[PDB]
């Protein structure tokens with residue numbers, strides 16, 4: 114039952130063999146090289162079956178062969194430590210059952226660089242892989258380096274049934290480095306936990322905070338330069354626990370993506386549609402469990418579909434009129450006049466692709482927000498010129514053509530909570546409301562054509578509130594636990 118869910122419940126499974134660090138022996142400097150040659154000499158169709166044990170500092174491992182599989186002999190029993198990067202240049206390469214821990218990426222784009230087509234990372238575990246690379250404020254502006262753990266640079270990549278635990282230095286955990294055509298990557302059934310910033314005093318450099326406090330997402334799909342092309346990639350059926358990297362939990366920066374059916378539990382970070390068009394966010398379960406700085410989905414740019422999400426028990430910061438509030442659904446302001454067809458454009462100074470595309474043409478329907486401190490927030494935030502230029506942008510615009518239908522914001526338990534935060538500072542343009550139900554405070558409610566303040570009949574189905582005829586259909590929702598997400602083993606005797 115939802116309120117009573119905890120880390121223990123989501124991560125328990127019987128199906129999970131336990132692998133223990135100690136039954137593994139530390140390979141000598143000599144067997145590492147022997148392992149490395151095996152890697153580098155493999156031919157199309159071959160397979161390496163890493164014998165069990167701990168292998169420190171493989172360094173740079175380049176796989177040039179196609180149709181190969183590198184697996185541990187027993188899943189979870191080959192531990193790759195110190196500095197390593199697998200560089201997967203071949204097509205149809207599969208990594209399976211590996212553990213990356215007690216070490217760090219050998220180059221900043223991660224332990225695994227998936228450069229080929231149809232590359233796969235499955236059944237693998239990353240555990241606090243934060244070590245052994247240089248990590249200092251740089252001389253130029255005191256910026257700490259961005260290190261990722263996995264990056265995808267090819268097509269049809271798969272990252273499935275892994276565990277990604279304790280990323281706690283700067284850098285996005287999975288990055289998609291794409292080009293001008295669809296990538297169709299699948300990132301699914303993974304477990305993500307305990308991403309967290311400022312564990313090494315990074316924020317102590319006050320002047321550098323805006324950038325040092327950025328780039329701690331769990332995944333970024335696309336980036337500013339590539340954002341106006343489709344990725345058509347999927348972030349689905351993942352389980353995320355205490356993922357507190359930064360404001361963006363998932364930063365979508367390309368088009369036609371699906372970010373659907375994830376369970377996001379006690380994670381002080383939001384799904385963020387940051388750049389790019391026509392992304393779909395559906396059937397997620399966002400369970401704040403009353404943790405401060407939790408929230409649902411924040412939205413820039415055009416043509417997105419946000420439907421049938423279940424967002425509960427989220428809470429904003431502890432005690433500014435203009436604050437970028439974390440709500441269940443946040444319709445951001447941006448810096449371009451989209452109501453008159455303005456676009457971001459790499460050629461127009463101040464309006465480059467990495468800036469803020471005022472949301473437009475957004476479908477928001479059949480969501481259930483339950484006990485959310487800030488429910489649906491219509492943004493009034495300002496923006497800075499860039500991460501390196503602190504000047505505020507003059508020229509801020511509200512969302513346009515935002516269609517709300519069949520949403521339930523239920524703050525019946527604490528009706529002082531703000532269910533809808535409308536704002537005369539930036540009235541939405543062309544907003545419409547069809548069968549909305551908002552229970553709880555509505556700020557600037559005279560901005561809203563109509564809505565009901567009485568809940569439909571409420572039932573409980575497998576722990577969820579079901580509102581008759583409205584809100585998220587509970588038939589489409591279910592909690593992801595370690596019964597389908599994550600590797601088939603847990604590791605014991607690991608070190609952070």
Ligand SMILES: O=C(O)[C@@H]1O[C@@H](O[C@H]2[C@H](O)[C@H](O)[C@H](O[C@H]3[C@H](O)[C@H](O)[C@H](O[C@H]4[C@H](O)[C@H](O)[C@H](O[C@H]5[C@H](O)[C@H](O)[C@H](O[C@H]6[C@H](O)[C@H](O)[C@H](O)O[C@H]6C(=O)O)O[C@H]5C(=O)O)O[C@H]4C(=O)O)O[C@H]3C(=O)O)O[C@H]2C(=O)O)[C@@H](O)[C@@H](O)[C@@H]1O
Nearest residue numbers: 259285288323328336337338360364387436437467495497
């Ligand atoms: O607390 C409050 O209430 C308010 O706080 C402040 O406002 C803050 C906001 O609340 C919110 O955080 C907001 O965040 C901004 C942010 O400042 C910035 O504009 C960012 O923009 C995205 C852009 O795309 C940007 O260029 C950058 O992306 C870079 C970056 O290097 C990133 O790591 C990534 O790198 C990869 C890329 O492939 C690259 O080419 C290179 O290869 O390396 C890759 C890698 O290392 O992974 O992509 C780059 C790029 O492609 O350009 O960051 C992006 C992102 O993080 O999404 O996000 C904005 C956002 O709204 O999310 O603004 C904060 C702020 O401090 O201004 C206060 O100002 C006030 O409003 C409130 O009090």
Ligand SMILES: [Ca+2]
Nearest residue numbers: 327328359361
């Ligand atoms: Ca960010």
